[PDB]
Amino acid sequence: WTATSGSCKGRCFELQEVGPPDCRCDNLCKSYSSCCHDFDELCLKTARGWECTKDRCGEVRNEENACHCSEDCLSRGDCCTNYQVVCKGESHWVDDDCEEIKVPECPAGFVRPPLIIFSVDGFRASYMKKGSKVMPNIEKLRSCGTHAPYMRPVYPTKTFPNLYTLATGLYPESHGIVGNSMYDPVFDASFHLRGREKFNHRWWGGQPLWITATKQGVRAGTFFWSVSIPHERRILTILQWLSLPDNERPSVYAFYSEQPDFSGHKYGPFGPEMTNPLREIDKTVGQLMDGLKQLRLHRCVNVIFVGDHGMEDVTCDRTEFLSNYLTNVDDITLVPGTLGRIRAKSINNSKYDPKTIIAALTCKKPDQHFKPYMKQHLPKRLHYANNRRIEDIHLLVDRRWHVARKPLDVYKKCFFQGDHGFDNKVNSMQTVFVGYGPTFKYRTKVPPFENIELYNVMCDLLGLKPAPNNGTHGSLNHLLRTNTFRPTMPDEVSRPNYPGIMYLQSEFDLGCTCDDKVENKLEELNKRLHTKGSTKERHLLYGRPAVLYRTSYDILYHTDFESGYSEIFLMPLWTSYTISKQAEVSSIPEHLTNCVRPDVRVSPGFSQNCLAYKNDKQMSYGFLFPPYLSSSPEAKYDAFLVTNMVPMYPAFKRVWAYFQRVLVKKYASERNGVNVISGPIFDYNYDGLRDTEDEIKQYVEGSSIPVPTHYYSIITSCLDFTQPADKCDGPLSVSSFILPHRPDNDESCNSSEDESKWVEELMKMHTARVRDIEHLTGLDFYRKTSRSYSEILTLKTYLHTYESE
Ligand SMILES: *[C@@H]1O[C@H](CO)[C@@H](O[C@@H]2O[C@H](CO)[C@@H](O[C@@H]3O[C@H](CO[C@H]4O[C@H](CO)[C@@H](O)[C@H](O[C@H]5O[C@H](CO)[C@@H](O)[C@H](O)[C@@H]5O[C@H]5O[C@H](CO)[C@@H](O)[C@H](O)[C@@H]5O)[C@@H]4O)[C@@H](O)[C@H](O[C@H]4O[C@H](CO)[C@@H](O)[C@H](O)[C@@H]4O[C@H]4O[C@H](CO)[C@@H](O)[C@H](O)[C@@H]4O)[C@@H]3O)[C@H](O)[C@H]2NC(C)=O)[C@H](O)[C@H]1NC(C)=O
Ligand SMILES: Cn1c(=O)n(Cc2ccc(F)cc2)c2cnc(Cl)nc21
Ligand SMILES: [Ca+2]
Ligand SMILES: [Cl-]
Ligand SMILES: [K+]
Ligand code: NA
Ligand SMILES: [Zn+2]
């Protein structure tokens, strides 16, 4: 109930929202059906439209007009945005030459430059180039300010998860808005695009920017606008708020546009119909800029022009139906479209089985346009699992396609030509970023980055301390002229032991054997030097990784590789080695096929054993430093140490062996040498964070050898590839992956073919940032480089995406 009999007189677009049953006058009252009876008459004036004309110049103020051209309008703060152009001979902002804003130029009483976020739904990255002729205002912000060629959204590439990630710095799994449609089984409640449920605050986790600001004494405009409030009225409202007295005036504001998304669904991303919406959004930007210029704020405000996601060509004929795969299609609920989420239709159905559903959906039709996953098996880069609102069964849908339950869903709900939601590395889903103002850099291009990083920057722009979030604060310092955030490297928590030779061979009863019994002072001193770290500068190029948690571990040196060996997990946390362009690949000699060697530096008690692998009929083993890349036949024996062994399913060893024997040398050849750091990951609760020992669900049978859920590699070389990886003077180049350690290759439909036809495709899908690996391992990389720390932070956030340009 609302008492709509109150009045909006003197309250239009009030900032503080009044609670029921009092009627409301704020920019959301329409969404709640709660506006005072006179809200339209008073607050949504339209008379005479949105622009001054020469005949209105100097008019007698008529309060009924949408905006004013009378002499008093600048002091009232309610001129039409083109007032000074039409009436006072001024130029439009877009017609002015770009001039560097070295310092804020603000009116008296402004304590800080305001921030205005201009957000655009479905604004695909390539519109910046393809629409450039029809977007002069946006093209000027872009060329004069700081811009990226694109910004990467979060998965799923839907509106509510992306806008709320922009606002929070959080992955959807952490903020809770994991789709545009959701069921929360604890609440027993459903969230929908349409309806009242989505207004309940219990869906919305983390701390969005407007709350961060308010809590720290920075006033915020409201970030949401009822759909029926026209864009011209939104801009005029922002400009009116900016004319409030200093103690009342917000410092941060958001504008939102439903375009070009709304038309892009109807017409596809590049339909001829799309030129007009792009022109219209450009005109709205021009109104804002002209309006700021009238207020003398155009060299004071920082403006961010940012999108939520792009838009792909998708038609009703490109739909896969689960009714063509499942016998039991009426026993499941499907969240459908550009992703799939599957759960039981009834929690009382004891004959529901996820294993049979997954098997029925796996590589069943030659050109199948979706792939099923249990959510914990999704690429870790998507960070899409650790929330009860995310169904265990997930379908990753190919770009340009939909999935639906039955054909009748598609025609009893072609219509649309565009959609979005796909994998966030897909080129058509990429969106835009431009920052313009005194605090941003002048005429500066920055590399692509993820939208989770922006919250920290928006906090820096406002002098706010960000709430804990998933950005890496300092990674976007290169966008900023001032207000940079200068973090210190984390302190190492555990210091390594450096064991010498402490055990005789016969102390070990590991059930291992090696044919290594062949017996020179010219080389005996040499072998000692290698075990003491004489080659470590070659193989550990960026310092040792720091261990950021409490544990017991040893540094182990070898001719060809260095490792940090965990006495707790019985295997390396990390193994580091460098492969030059000139390195040669060799085979594992026949007599060494099954060779495993005790390490006399490490006690039998803290070592793996071969008998456990013999007894465990599902589990085999591989090596972190590859025996294929040994520098000499003698150095090769080090690669078979029990301290370089890790547990591996046979199906996984197909993947790992091809990576180590073929791909490492291919990358060294292409990149002029590479440095590789590889190791295990344990994430059994799929939270993106390193497991403690008590979270491990699987061990090698009969032993305390824990089974990794994933294996990582970080592959670093010189960005200037004229220099070899081990003699690099300037910036670095990285690619990394987090491969799932699975007992089958059911993910790769072409796996019965030679590894050359499917392994690199799998690895590309599981590409990762260094920062993802840091979370998963509790390690901190790149501690000793010649590079600035902010530059290293940017490197650690890099994702190699393997999309075309
Ligand atoms: C991305 O960045 C984010 C933000 O930094 C990272 O997420 C943080 O990770 C921390 C570790 O996982 C986590 O810290 C925990 O906080 C618990 C209290 O949590 C509440 O309070 C905070 C602060 O206001 C709030 O933010 C939380 O919000 C969550 O929950 C509500 C649901 O009510 C949601 O609306 C909201 O969206 C958010 O959900 C997300 O996180 C929760 C977990 O908190 C997930 O379950 C959801 O799926 C979703 O992803 C909360 O309202 C605190 O209780 C924890 O302490 C436990 O563990 C420690 C061990 O050290 C121990 O000392 C305690 O005893 C306690 O254990 C007890 O409880 C156990 C479980 O019930 C039980 O088994 C034991 O026996 C014990 O009794 C813990 O410190 C922090 O909450 C989140 N924050 C957010 C916003 O998500 C995220 O990791 C980053 N991601 C990556 C990849 O880096
Ligand atoms: C889900 N969601 C949000 O979090 N915001 C606020 C917001 C966040 C980031 C931003 F850059 C601008 C505005 C929204 C505004 N409008 C709509 Cl239809 N949905 C929204
Ligand atoms: Ca974990
Ligand atoms: Cl969804
Ligand atoms: K075995
Ligand atoms: Na397969
Ligand atoms: Zn859309």
Swiss-Prot record:
Binds 2 Zn(2+) ions per subunit. Its main location: secreted. Inhibited by vanadate. Inhibited by micromolar levels of bile salts, such as tauroursodeoxycholate. Not inhibited by taurodeoxycholate. Not inhibited by hydroxysterols, such as 7-hydroxycholesterol, testosterone, dexamethasone and prednisolone. Inhibited by EDTA and EGTA. PROSITE patterns: SMB_1 (PS00524), SMB_2 (PS50958). Abundantly expressed in cerebrum and cerebellum. Localized in secretory epithelial cells in the brain and the eye including choroid plexus epithelial cells, ciliary epithelial cells, iris pigment epithelial cells, and retinal pigment cells. Its EC number is 3.1.4.39, 3.1.4.4. Transmembrane segments: none annotated. It is an enzyme of class 3 (hydrolase). One of its GO terms (biological process) is positive regulation of oligodendrocyte differentiation. Glycans are attached at residues 3, 348, 360, 470, 750. 1-tetradecanoyl-sn-glycerol 3-phosphate binds at residues 159, 180, 261, 420. The nuclease-like domain is most probably catalytically inactive as residues that are essential for catalysis in the DNA/RNA non-specific endonucleases are not conserved. However, it is required for the stability of the protein and the catalytic activity born by the Phosphodiesterase domain. PANTHER family: ECTONUCLEOTIDE PYROPHOSPHATASE/PHOSPHODIESTERASE (PTHR10151), ECTONUCLEOTIDE PYROPHOSPHATASE_PHOSPHODIESTERASE FAMILY MEMBER 2 (PTHR10151:SF21). This is Autotaxin. It comes from Rattus norvegicus.
